[PDB]
Amino acid sequence: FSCNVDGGSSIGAGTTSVYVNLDPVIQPGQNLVVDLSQHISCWNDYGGWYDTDHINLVQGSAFAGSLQSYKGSLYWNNVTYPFPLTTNTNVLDIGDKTPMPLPLKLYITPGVVIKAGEVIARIHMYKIATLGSGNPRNFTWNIISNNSVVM
Ligand SMILES: O=[N+]([O-])c1ccccc1O[C@@H]1O[C@H](CO)[C@H](O)[C@H](O)[C@H]1O
Known part of the structure; x- marks a missing residue:
């Protein structure tokens, strides 16, 4: 199983920076959106649904930190969770070699x-x-x- 960021070199584990362009102003009472589908993709390293990968996001994922005071939501694979995450998410299954x-x-x-x-x-x-x-x-x-991002 492998991922990449902005079409870069393959990643098999560990910590990676993901840079995002955000709305330069954040309106009071309105959600700021960080669409990570625009940057992170992963794939099955064989394809063909032979050794299928099972992916989820993990309890404890949070704002940083310093910025922990914020609340929000995390959308993952058909479910919107409170954020920071207090539980593990549903599983996404990855079996194609074409990046998802x-x-x-x-x-x-x-x-x-x-x-x-x-x-x-x-x-x-x-x-x-x-x-x-x-x-x-x-x-x-x-x-x-x-x-x-301001006011
Ligand atoms: O993770 N890899 O770098 C890698 C590269 C080529 C072939 C298999 C491979 O790892 C293999 O991939 C399969 C299907 O994605 C499973 O994730 C398996 O656990 C992993 O060892």
């Missing part, structure tokens, strides 16, 4: 509120396959804005 953009969106409920270049969320993703032990692996996606 992750069905993942973060919603952030509100001078500069978000600083470009700082980690603003840490999303832990868990993989286990089907054959043998399943060869479980952990990924962490460190979400970083390319731009300031």
Whole structure:
């Protein structure tokens, strides 16, 4: 099982920065959207649904931190969860070699509120396959804005 960010080199585990362009202003009482399907994709390294991968997001995934005071929602594969995550999400099954953009969106409920270049969320993703032990692996996606977000 492998992923990449913005079509870059393959990733098999570990922590990766994911840079995102956000709305430069965050309106009071309105959600700021961080569409991660636009950046992260993963695939089965054989294809053909032979050793199918099973992917979920993990309890404890949260805002960073410093910025933990915020609340929000995390959309993952047909379900919208409160964020930070207090439980593991549903499982997404990956069996094609064609990359699948992750069905993942973060919603952030509100001078500069978000600083470009700082980690603003840490999303832990868990993989286990089907054959043998399943060869479980952990990924962490460190979400970083390319731009300031204000008021
Ligand atoms: O993870 N890999 O870098 C990798 C590259 C080529 C072939 C298998 C492979 O890993 C294998 O992939 C299969 C299907 O995705 C399962 O995830 C299995 O657990 C993994 O070891």
